[PDB]
Design an enzyme around this catalytic site. Structure first.
Site, PDB file in Angstrom:
ATOM      1  N   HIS A  85       0.808  -1.218   0.143  1.00 43.29           N
ATOM      2  CA  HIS A  85      -0.013  -0.166   0.093  1.00 43.29           C
ATOM      3  C   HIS A  85       0.762   1.068  -0.110  1.00 43.29           C
ATOM      4  O   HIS A  85       1.970   1.359   0.790  1.00 43.29           O
ATOM      5  CB  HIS A  85      -0.854   0.046   1.114  1.00 43.29           C
ATOM      6  CG  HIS A  85      -0.681   0.000   2.398  1.00 43.29           C
ATOM      7  ND1 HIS A  85      -0.395   1.489   2.909  1.00 43.29           N
ATOM      8  CD2 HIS A  85      -0.175  -0.763   3.439  1.00 43.29           C
ATOM      9  CE1 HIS A  85      -0.020   1.366   4.519  1.00 43.29           C
ATOM     10  NE2 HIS A  85       0.097   0.063   4.486  1.00 43.29           N
ATOM     11  N   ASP A  97       5.746   2.686   7.350  1.00 44.04           N
ATOM     12  CA  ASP A  97       4.299   2.180   7.029  1.00 44.04           C
ATOM     13  C   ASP A  97       3.555   3.236   5.924  1.00 44.04           C
ATOM     14  O   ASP A  97       2.755   4.136   6.474  1.00 44.04           O
ATOM     15  CB  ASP A  97       3.187   2.363   8.122  1.00 44.04           C
ATOM     16  CG  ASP A  97       2.027   1.379   8.059  1.00 44.04           C
ATOM     17  OD1 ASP A  97       1.973   0.910   6.940  1.00 44.04           O
ATOM     18  OD2 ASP A  97       1.110   1.586   8.943  1.00 44.04           O
ATOM     19  N   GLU A 131      -5.304   1.870   1.992  1.00 37.29           N
ATOM     20  CA  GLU A 131      -5.180   0.677   2.808  1.00 37.29           C
ATOM     21  C   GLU A 131      -5.593   0.977   4.569  1.00 37.29           C
ATOM     22  O   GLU A 131      -6.248   0.212   5.253  1.00 37.29           O
ATOM     23  CB  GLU A 131      -4.159  -0.024   2.919  1.00 37.29           C
ATOM     24  CG  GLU A 131      -3.738  -1.239   3.762  1.00 37.29           C
ATOM     25  CD  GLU A 131      -3.321  -0.972   5.131  1.00 37.29           C
ATOM     26  OE1 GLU A 131      -3.480   0.042   5.531  1.00 37.29           O
ATOM     27  OE2 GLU A 131      -3.365  -1.997   5.945  1.00 37.29           O
ATOM     28  N   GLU A 132      -5.329   2.301   4.604  1.00 41.90           N
ATOM     29  CA  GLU A 132      -5.342   2.685   6.017  1.00 41.90           C
ATOM     30  C   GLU A 132      -6.753   3.009   6.663  1.00 41.90           C
ATOM     31  O   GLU A 132      -7.258   3.119   7.594  1.00 41.90           O
ATOM     32  CB  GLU A 132      -4.545   3.845   6.407  1.00 41.90           C
ATOM     33  CG  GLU A 132      -3.075   3.732   6.177  1.00 41.90           C
ATOM     34  CD  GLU A 132      -2.659   2.840   7.276  1.00 41.90           C
ATOM     35  OE1 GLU A 132      -3.253   2.279   8.296  1.00 41.90           O
ATOM     36  OE2 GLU A 132      -1.429   2.362   7.353  1.00 41.90           O
ATOM     37  N   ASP A 160       4.517  -4.856   3.710  1.00 40.71           N
ATOM     38  CA  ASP A 160       3.668  -3.657   4.511  1.00 40.71           C
ATOM     39  C   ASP A 160       4.628  -3.756   5.899  1.00 40.71           C
ATOM     40  O   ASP A 160       4.462  -4.471   6.595  1.00 40.71           O
ATOM     41  CB  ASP A 160       2.313  -4.057   4.594  1.00 40.71           C
ATOM     42  CG  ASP A 160       1.553  -2.913   5.282  1.00 40.71           C
ATOM     43  OD1 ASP A 160       2.256  -1.867   5.643  1.00 40.71           O
ATOM     44  OD2 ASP A 160       0.260  -3.196   5.516  1.00 40.71           O
ATOM     45  N   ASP A 262      16.026  -7.353  -0.661  1.00 42.06           N
ATOM     46  CA  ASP A 262      16.505  -8.415  -1.598  1.00 42.06           C
ATOM     47  C   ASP A 262      15.606  -9.910  -1.687  1.00 42.06           C
ATOM     48  O   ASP A 262      15.593 -10.385  -2.576  1.00 42.06           O
ATOM     49  CB  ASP A 262      17.784  -8.661  -1.019  1.00 42.06           C
ATOM     50  CG  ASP A 262      18.687  -7.598  -1.169  1.00 42.06           C
ATOM     51  OD1 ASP A 262      18.749  -6.626  -1.883  1.00 42.06           O
ATOM     52  OD2 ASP A 262      19.759  -7.521  -0.241  1.00 42.06           O
TER      53      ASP A 262
HETATM   54  N1  LIG Z   1      -1.855  -2.597  10.399  1.00 38.08           N
HETATM   55  C1  LIG Z   1      -0.955  -2.702   9.345  1.00 38.08           C
HETATM   56  C2  LIG Z   1       0.460  -3.018  10.016  1.00 38.08           C
HETATM   57  C3  LIG Z   1       0.466  -4.602  10.424  1.00 38.08           C
HETATM   58  C4  LIG Z   1       0.345  -5.107  11.874  1.00 38.08           C
HETATM   59  N2  LIG Z   1       0.174  -6.345  11.981  1.00 38.08           N
HETATM   60  C5  LIG Z   1       0.587  -6.900  10.565  1.00 38.08           C
HETATM   61  C6  LIG Z   1       0.612  -7.915  10.202  1.00 38.08           C
HETATM   62  C7  LIG Z   1       1.023  -8.187   8.707  1.00 38.08           C
HETATM   63  C8  LIG Z   1       1.051  -7.165   7.817  1.00 38.08           C
HETATM   64  C9  LIG Z   1       0.638  -5.829   8.405  1.00 38.08           C
HETATM   65  C10 LIG Z   1       0.645  -5.665   9.657  1.00 38.08           C
HETATM   66  C11 LIG Z   1      -0.770  -1.339   8.898  1.00 38.08           C
HETATM   67  O1  LIG Z   1      -1.273  -0.295   9.049  1.00 38.08           O
HETATM   68  O2  LIG Z   1      -0.047  -1.077   7.986  1.00 38.08           O
HETATM   69 CA   LIG Z   2      20.754  -5.521  -1.330  1.00 38.54          CA
HETATM   70 ZN   LIG Z   3       0.794  -0.862   6.174  1.00 37.44          ZN
HETATM   71 ZN   LIG Z   4      -0.698   1.350   8.862  1.00 38.21          ZN
END
Ligand SMILES: N[C@H](Cc1c[nH]c2ccccc12)C(=O)O
Ligand SMILES: [Ca+2]
Ligand SMILES: [Zn+2]
Ligand SMILES: [Zn+2]
EC number: 3.4.11.24
Length: 273
Positions: A85, A97, A131-132, A160, A262
């Site tokens: 995302h 993030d 995504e958020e 992510d 990588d």
């Molecule tokens: N909530 C997601 C971050 C996140 C937390 N646990 C996981 C497990 C697998 C993938 C992502 C996440 C975000 O805000 O990006």
């Molecule tokens: Ca590298």
């Molecule tokens: Zn995220």
């Molecule tokens: Zn997030």
């Protein structure tokens, strides 16, 4: 697979940081920093030879976008997808993030073109909006992908949060072949990994597409045993700046971002033959 240059991944992050600063401090859905992020990634892909598509949707009264990039060629009945995302929360720039995953997927896509790679499977990369807000962009994509095209998907790889400053090395425990490919990469580095609706693989998983991915941790605290195996600080969050204004260029562990970028390329090469 090529070795993804860390410096190139970090240069994408710098560009996203600047985009956030130029657009009210964020890259959030419905705000100008998101569309500016899309324009940056799309321009790099177009120059590399990808066929790009802007998929528009409406959520919360505002226009959103997914950026889809198809690498011409390969078996149309066997498509490998990888994505990340590209939106942030509105409190900050969302560099870990999810600039981290967005930049790793972009540099892998660019590496495909630089290597002159012709995968057996058709390759498609995606950068999801909103995504958020609740996986809105990836849900829109899956919901609008006809069943004949869904059946052509060999896998969806998600990236992510892959540069967390106090990282763990988590590999999704979903499709066994995709999981083994990632775990094998880290085994060759002698870096231990642990098994991981939380991100954009969920809409794919829920309709039976094989999925997998990499994650370096968010708000949960690193345990004593995890600091023994990976370093950093026990008792502190993997990402102390999760969803915060401080999710900035300072909020990246370069080793984790390098290794996971990588690994992304290793998996994309391995699973597309
Ligand atoms: N909530 C997601 C971050 C996140 C937390 N646990 C996981 C497990 C697998 C993938 C992502 C996440 C975000 O805000 O990006
Ligand atoms: Ca590298
Ligand atoms: Zn995220
Ligand atoms: Zn997030």
């Amino acid at each position: 697979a090529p070795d993804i240059p860390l410096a190139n991944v970090k240069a994408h992050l710098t560009q996203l940081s600047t985009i956030a600063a130029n657009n009210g401090g964020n890259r959030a859905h419905g705000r100008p920093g998101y569309k500016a992020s899309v324009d940056y990634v799309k321009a790099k892909l177009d120059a590399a030879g990808y066929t790009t598509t802007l998929q528009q949707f409406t959520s919360g009264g505002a226009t959103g976008y997914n950026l889809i990039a198809n690498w011409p060629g390969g078996d149309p009945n066997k498509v490998l997808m990888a994505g990340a995302h590209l939106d942030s929360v509105s409190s900050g720039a969302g560099i870990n993030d999810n600039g981290s995953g967005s930049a790793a997927v972009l540099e892998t896509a660019l590496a495909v073109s630089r290597a002159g790679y012709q995968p057996d499977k058709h390759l498609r990369f995606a950068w999801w909006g909103a995504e958020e807000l609740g996986l809105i962009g990836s849900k829109f994509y899956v919901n609008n992908l006809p069943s004949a095209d869904r059946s052509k998907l060999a896998g969806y790889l998600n990236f992510d949060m892959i540069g967390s400053p106090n990282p763990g090395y988590f590999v999704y425990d979903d499709d066994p072949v995709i999981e083994k490919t990632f775990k094998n990469y880290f085994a060759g580095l002698n870096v231990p990994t642990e098994i991981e609706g939380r991100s954009d693989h969920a809409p794919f998983k829920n309709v039976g597409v094989p999925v997998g991915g990499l994650f370096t941790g968010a708000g949960y605290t690193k345990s004593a045993a995890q600091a023994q195996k990976w370093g950093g600080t026990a008792g502190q969050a993997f990402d102390r700046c999760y969803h915060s204004s401080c999710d900035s260029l300072s909020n990246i562990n370069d080793t984790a971002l390098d290794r996971n970028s990588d690994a992304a390329a290793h998996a994309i090469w391995t699973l597309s033959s």
